[PDB]
Design a protein around this ligand. Structure first.
Ligand SMILES: C=C(C)[C@H]1CN[C@H](C(=O)O)[C@H]1CC(=O)O
Ligand SMILES: C=C(C)[C@H]1CN[C@H](C(=O)O)[C@H]1CC(=O)O
Ligand SMILES: [Zn+2]
Ligand SMILES: [Zn+2]
Ligand SMILES: [Zn+2]
Ligand SMILES: [Zn+2]
Lengths: 258, 258
């Protein structure tokens, strides 16, 4: 049986090769998560087909409908066998799918254009001339919506009502907005994407300060999957043999431009 | 039923309260893991008894007998329901028991007596007047035993044959040895204990340089145990509510003496 592995387009995790229309199946993708999926499949000893999540979403549960969407929905409801992506391990998700141990560690962080006079979340919260916001959905925005920490409530209260809306739909847009705002827009995103962008050629962005929390990305399987054990053990093996670190360096630093 | 929670005496995770003989049950211990276990029990609504592992070991498979010892042994042989302790998540353990997502993050690190002329693993490897070693058994030792990185092969090559033995039976042993060797002994231990010792007293040791790798502690349960799922959820919950951060500050830094 060919395992259906669901993923999502996000640099440098999963990307279309330049000639992808002249290629087929797995070959048309490249990235960190493409290499991981391959490694995982090797050690789990399985055939797999990569497939892009139909609705292009990570996974959230509808307030009223209460149905899960995205990659999480595809795992829960029988569309896919495993998800390999920058899917943040969170309580709400783990309640309905299983996550392997983290294959990558991360935290919420601040991206600014070099020269911007802010150096921490407090600096942002005590001012207004510099706008800031998160992705329009995902674990980062949820982190802010739920926080009861003084500076983060305040940042949430501000973000909610700010318009022009501070929320953007993609990482590409948050970044493009940082670069084009002449130091008037920050951008809160996962430290991993921050570090990636840092090495991208205009070299005019930078992470500032420390992370706001400590998370990880995990490989996901439907709860009770006969694959869950093998997948988790493969991730650990790949970690201990240092291959996860080599893939991070390859996609983040060897290919960096700054 | 009452749940047996196996654990081990290791500061500041599990320690005896000064007047422990005048107290009974779980009340006679304090520390980070005692707090963690309390929290996990409240949310995974269960009664529990803290049980200090009989052999005072963490968990390794005897080469000839092939029997698992220590906390891992408790779980494998069905004598404990869950293990809460500075138990490193590793592939060899995960083959036989289950781990939660990491409740703490760590790396292998160096501990010197202040004023010792070394600052990296390399500095250690390229010299001989300063002796160094690891705990007599555990994940750390294994990291060196299996490393294929030249500098670590070399350090391991040396630690194998050095005499007197450079391996210590306990953390306290390694620390007493560092303090009493006047600069001639350096201790390769987990960054977490290193950081605790440095804030402890007298105030004569420090962590130096970066970590040689990156791992975490997990709460463990018997492989395929119904309890596993809810325990892992409790850990994610405590991570998100920020209680793991609080607890770490409580036992490492709020009490700092240096
Ligand atoms: C790219 C997106 C929308 C994802 C990636 N990880 C997070 C998640 O798994 O929710 C989201 C980013 C964020 O929330 O900052
Ligand atoms: C304290 C001891 C012997 C433990 C703690 N975690 C590691 C483990 O779980 O094996 C060991 C330390 C180490 O290996 O440096
Ligand atoms: Zn491989
Ligand atoms: Zn608007
Ligand atoms: Zn609680
Ligand atoms: Zn000897």
């Amino acid at each position: 049986r060919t395992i259906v592995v669901t993923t999502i387009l996000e640099s440098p995790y999963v990307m279309y090769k330049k000639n992808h229309e002249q290629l087929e199946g797995n070959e048309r993708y490249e990235g960190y998560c493409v290499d991981l999926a391959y490694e995982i499949a090797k050690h789990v000893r399985i055939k797999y087909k990569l497939s892009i999540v139909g609705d292009g979403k990570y996974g959230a549960r509808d307030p009223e409908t209460k149905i899960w969407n995205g990659m999480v929905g595809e795992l829960v409801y029988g569309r896919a066998d495993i998800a390999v992506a920058p899917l943040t391990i969170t309580l709400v998700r783990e309640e309905v799918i299983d996550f392997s141990k983290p294959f990558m560690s991360l935290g919420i962080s601040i991206m600014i254009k070099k020269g911007t006079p802010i150096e921490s979340a407090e600096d942002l919260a005590k001012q207004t001339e510099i706008a800031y916001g998160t992705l329009a959905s995902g674990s980062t925005k949820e982190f802010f919506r739920r926080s009861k920490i003084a500076v983060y409530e305040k940042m949430w209260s501000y973000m909610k009502s700010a318009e022009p809306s501070v929320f953007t739909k993609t990482t590409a847009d948050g970044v493009a907005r940082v670069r084009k705002s002449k130091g008037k827009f920050a951008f809160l995103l996962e430290s991993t994407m921050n570090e990636y962008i840092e090495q991208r050629k205009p070299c005019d962005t930078m992470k500032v300060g420390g992370n706001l929390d400590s998370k990880g990305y995990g490989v996901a399987t439907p709860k009770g999957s006969a694959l869950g054990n093998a997948v988790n053990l493969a991730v650990l093996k790949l970690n201990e043999q240092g291959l996860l670190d080599k893939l991070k360096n390859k996609w983040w630093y060897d290919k960096g431009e700054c």
